[PDB]
Amino acid sequence: SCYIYWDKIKRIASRLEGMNYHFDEMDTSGVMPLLDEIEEIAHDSTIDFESAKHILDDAEMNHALSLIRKFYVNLGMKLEMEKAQEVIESDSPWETLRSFYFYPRYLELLKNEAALGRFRRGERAVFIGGGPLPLTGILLSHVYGMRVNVVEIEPDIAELSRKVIEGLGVDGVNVITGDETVIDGLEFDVLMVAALAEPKRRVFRNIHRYVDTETRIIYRTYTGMRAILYAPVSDDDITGFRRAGVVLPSGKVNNTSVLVFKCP
Amino acid sequence: SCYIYWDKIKRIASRLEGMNYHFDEMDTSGVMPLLDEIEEIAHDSTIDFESAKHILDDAEMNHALSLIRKFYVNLGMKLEMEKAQEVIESDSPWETLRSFYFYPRYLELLKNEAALGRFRRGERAVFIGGGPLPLTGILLSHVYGMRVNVVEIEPDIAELSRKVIEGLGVDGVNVITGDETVIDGLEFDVLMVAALAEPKRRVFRNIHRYVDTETRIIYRTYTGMRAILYAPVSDDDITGFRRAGVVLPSGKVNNTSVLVFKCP
Numbered sequence: 001s002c003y004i005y006w007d008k009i010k011r012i013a014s015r016l017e018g019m020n021y022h023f024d025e026m027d028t029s030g031v032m033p034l035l036d037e038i039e040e041i042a043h044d045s046t047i048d049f050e051s052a053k054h055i056l057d058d059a060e061m062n063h064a065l066s067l068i069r070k071f072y073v074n075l076g077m078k079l080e081m082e083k084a085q086e087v088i089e090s091d092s093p094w095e096t097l098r099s100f101y102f103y104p105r106y107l108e109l110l111k112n113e114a115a116l117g118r119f120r121r122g123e124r125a126v127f128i129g130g131g132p133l134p135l136t137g138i139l140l141s142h143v144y145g146m147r148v149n150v151v152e153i154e155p156d157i158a159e160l161s162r163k164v165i166e167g168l169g170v171d172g173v174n175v176i177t178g179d180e181t182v183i184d185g186l187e188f189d190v191l192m193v194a195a196l197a198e199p200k201r202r203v204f205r206n207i208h209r210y211v212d213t214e215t216r217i218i219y220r221t222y223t224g225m226r227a228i229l230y231a232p233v234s235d236d237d238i239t240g241f242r243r244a245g246v247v248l249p250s251g252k253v254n255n256t257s258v259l260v261f262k263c264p
Numbered sequence: 265s266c267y268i269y270w271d272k273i274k275r276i277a278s279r280l281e282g283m284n285y286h287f288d289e290m291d292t293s294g295v296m297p298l299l300d301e302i303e304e305i306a307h308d309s310t311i312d313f314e315s316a317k318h319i320l321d322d323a324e325m326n327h328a329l330s331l332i333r334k335f336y337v338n339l340g341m342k343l344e345m346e347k348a349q350e351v352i353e354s355d356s357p358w359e360t361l362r363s364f365y366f367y368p369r370y371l372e373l374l375k376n377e378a379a380l381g382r383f384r385r386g387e388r389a390v391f392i393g394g395g396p397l398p399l400t401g402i403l404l405s406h407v408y409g410m411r412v413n414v415v416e417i418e419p420d421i422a423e424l425s426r427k428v429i430e431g432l433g434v435d436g437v438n439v440i441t442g443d444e445t446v447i448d449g450l451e452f453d454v455l456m457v458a459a460l461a462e463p464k465r466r467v468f469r470n471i472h473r474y475v476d477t478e479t480r481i482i483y484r485t486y487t488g489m490r491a492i493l494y495a496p497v498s499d500d501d502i503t504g505f506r507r508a509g510v511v512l513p514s515g516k517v518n519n520t521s522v523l524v525f526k527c528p
């Protein structure tokens with residue numbers, strides 16, 4: 001094969017090489033054009049899923065793919081961290097939050113997930129992998145009227161995220177510091193897993209031990225050319241579960257959302 | 265995992281296995297219920313493509329899947345053989361043709377492909393894998409006004425197909441007895457490869473030798489739950505080609521149609 005996107009990807013990657021192993025030092029505003037380049041390819045609806053797989057699975061693409069994924073994960077983390085701090089310091093926290101680069105996609109992502117998982121007011125949600133800016137948790141309560149526990153493994157990140165929630169004056173959203181195993185002492189209707197929650201194998205194996213067959217579990221992954229951004233959840237990762245539904249993204253939304261149930 | 269389709273599929277395969285034990289010769293009328301049970305699974309639009317591979321390609325499904333795929337091919341061949349002879353004997357050949365079980369699906373499929381392939385009246389088309397009832401060839405002339413060569417490897421099947429074309433009074437459809445290698449000796453604007461043309465790897469290697477980079481090539485395959493019917497064309501099969509468009513089926517149509525060009 002001979003896809004035009006192959007060379008386009010190699011070229012972008014060539015301009016990332018010089019940042020390798022130090023992407024966390026990126027200037028956030030300065031690198032937005034690079035994210036645009038990458039997203040032009042990721043979001044191209046003329047690329048079929050078989051062609052995307054052809055490109056992303058080729059051994060000659062391994063190194064370029066690694067660079068793009070490192071860039072993406074580090075930019076996302078830094079953008080969230082910076083916005084969390086801005087929200088806490090703001091006189092207009094909800095307006096500040098609404099200016100977050102990814103805010104509109106999150107609204108769409110959540111709308112997708114709420115249909116998939118049939119969310120209702122007063123249902124209890126647990127979200128694994130809150131991060132510094134726990135936007136999903138916030139919207140679960142703010143839009144969908146759910147009662148929410150967000151789980152975050154890093155104590156300092158957890159503390160920041162609580163300050164964001166409090167700054168906004170959002171109710172019914174609590175942050176629990178811990179690993180995924182904290183769900184043992186929770187009672188909940190819906191469990192969600194962040195796209196960035198890692199390592200997938202350990203996390204899903206632990207979830208399997210603590211949910212029953214009625215618990216709606218939604219996790220986020222990457223399909224098609226969007227898999228250029230981040231490694232998709234593998235089939236091995238979700239052993240012991242059955243897939244019940246999927247929402248594939250459109251527009252600028254990156255994540256595919258997957259509904260699974262514990263077997264049987 | 266633990267898909268309820270697994271039990272359903274194994275039970276259908278059990279019935280197929282038992283039937284095969286008693287008869288080598290298919291009873292076309294008698295097995296229509298079995299086909300309908302299989303197609304109800306294939307046509308389940310609630311199941312996404314990724315989930316389909318999780319259910320169909322699971323290791324313990326291989327035996328059942330192979331039986332279903334053998335049934336599907338043998339039934340299709342027998343239905344075509346039977347209808348071909350009926351058409352040849354009929355005082356009302358078109359009425360007889362239209363009563364063919366899959367007839368309306370071919371109309372919808374060819375519409376998909378004519379858009380994908382930008383078919384124009386008077387263009388030369390070659391179709392590899394005509395079978396006894398060369399409906400695609402017939403439609404390419406009758407509806408699309410193309411000048412058509414249909415290629416069929418089995419001499420007796422090729423002969424039968426010529427009698428069907430003559431019975432229908434269809435002009436502009438010639439049948440070539442041979443394998444795919446006959447295309448070196450032909451001029452054509454579009455090349456089509458039947459869903460059932462085999463073996464895929466050899467067919468595409470031969471095509472690659474004998475076409476240029478400007479010639480439109482459309483092949484038929486199976487995706488999602490429709491892969492229960494027949495083994496899909498693999499990305500390895502199309503090495504040396506690039507995908508340039510895809511039409512996914514809906515309704516009762518079974519085939520996905522893919523446009524490729526020879527690289528580079």
Ligand SMILES: N[C@@H](CCN[C@@H](CCN[C@@H](CCC(=O)O)C(=O)O)C(=O)O)C(=O)O
Binds near residue numbers: 080134252
């Ligand atoms: N703090 C986040 C969790 C961290 N990020 C999210 C990512 C959400 N993805 C969005 C935003 C853009 C992106 O991730 O590239 C999308 O798919 O369009 C996750 O990992 O699930 C939250 O509250 O959901």
Ligand SMILES: N[C@@H](CCN[C@@H](CCN[C@@H](CCC(=O)O)C(=O)O)C(=O)O)C(=O)O
Binds near residue numbers: 344401459
């Ligand atoms: N005689 C046939 C060739 C044999 N069948 C075709 C298959 C046409 N597929 C149709 C008919 C139903 C089916 O094949 O299951 C569809 O996808 O809905 C092929 O192999 O390309 C023809 O003329 O196209």
Ligand SMILES: [Br-]
Binds near residue numbers: 297298
């Ligand atoms: Br039966």
Ligand SMILES: [Br-]
Binds near residue numbers: 357
């Ligand atoms: Br007639």
